[PDB]
């Protein structure tokens, strides 16, 4: 079985490279952040432009939804994170304390905490209600490329250009495990599988790997794409067939069979690097987004 994703919509409106796209957990909306300092909200099913959210002084590298779909957090080159009320577009809180560009961010499942990663090589945990920093983890010795909570928020996984993935106990701040692999290629993205048992990690040697967290073992490798320069988001697609989805520096979206590691589709249509992909939580829908020469988001639909 292979998917048959086909282009349904192209979404335009950002005036610089798009950095990140995410579907709201309730399936209604797509949020996009951009080097143009703006967040935009789009209808998930029709691509209809809904609204622009502004306030960052410099470009945004990541955006993420709270679990009730009511809040967003954005990570900006202005060295802050901002928490936004989606329906009003208002900035509720500005999270200050990183001493360099903020690159990546995520809510925990309860959405009372935000985790962030920065070029200052640290990971920070923030209280959503007050906006205060709760913990700083001296997590890495290079920029932190990705941070992600597991399914019940008890663990954080962080990745870095230093070649490490590290799993942290959220509450105690203690590093429980470090994944190290051979020649230490920079790690550009990382995230837990939906069941919390595996970690998908992208490295800047054109490689994606699926690790068993408990055993510290690489179980699967996925190749064929180009990824040497950018921190490209990758996903587990679970609504239909079990795929791995990623962008690529050859302007294609790659879809792999998770178990066999075979490439099952390449989505063509972007005209610059596909920096970001997202999978819809209930439909077989992929959103993809691309850099300066393109600046658009594409929505793709499959029957499986």
């Amino acid at each position: 079985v292979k998917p048959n994703y086909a282009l349904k919509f192209t979404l335009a409106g950002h005036t610089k490279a798009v950095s990140s796209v995410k579907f709201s957990p309730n399936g209604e909306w797509l949020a996009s952040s951009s080097a143009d300092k703006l967040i935009k909200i789009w209808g998930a099913y029709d691509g209809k432009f809904e609204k622009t959210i502004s306030g960052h002084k410099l470009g945004i590298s990541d955006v993420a939804w709270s679990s009730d779909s009511n809040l967003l957090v954005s990570a900006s080159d202005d060295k802050t994170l901002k928490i936004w009320d989606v329906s009003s577009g208002k900035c509720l809180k500005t999270l200050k304390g990183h001493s360099n560009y903020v690159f990546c961010c995520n809510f925990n499942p309860q959405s009372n905490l935000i985790v962030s990663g920065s070029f200052d090589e640290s990971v920070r945990i923030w209280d959503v209600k007050t906006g205060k920093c709760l913990k700083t983890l001296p997590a890495h010795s290079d920029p932190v490329s990705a941070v992600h909570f597991n399914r019940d928020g008890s663990l954080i996984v962080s990745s870095s250009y230093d070649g490490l993935c590290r799993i942290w106990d959220t509450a105690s701040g203690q590093c429980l495990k470090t994944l190290i692999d051979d020649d230490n290629p920079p790690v550009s993205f990382v995230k837990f599988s939906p069941n919390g048992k595996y970690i998908l990690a992208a490295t800047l040697d054109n490689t994606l790997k699926l690790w068993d967290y408990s055993k510290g073992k690489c179980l699967k490798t996925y190749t064929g794409h180009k990824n040497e320069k950018y921190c490209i988001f990758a996903n587990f697609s679970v609504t239909g067939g079990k795929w791995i989805v990623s962008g690529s520096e050859d302007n294609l979206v790659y879809i792999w069979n998770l178990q066999t590691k075979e490439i099952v589709q390449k989505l063509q249509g972007h005209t610059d690097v596909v920096i970001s992909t997202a999978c819809h939580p209930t439909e077989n829908i992929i959103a993809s987004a691309a850099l300066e020469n393109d600046k658009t988001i594409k929505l793709w639909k499959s029957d499986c």
Partner: peptide, 8 residues
Amino acid sequence: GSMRTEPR
């Protein structure tokens, strides 16, 4: 300008 959208 965003660090994610610039090459490493």
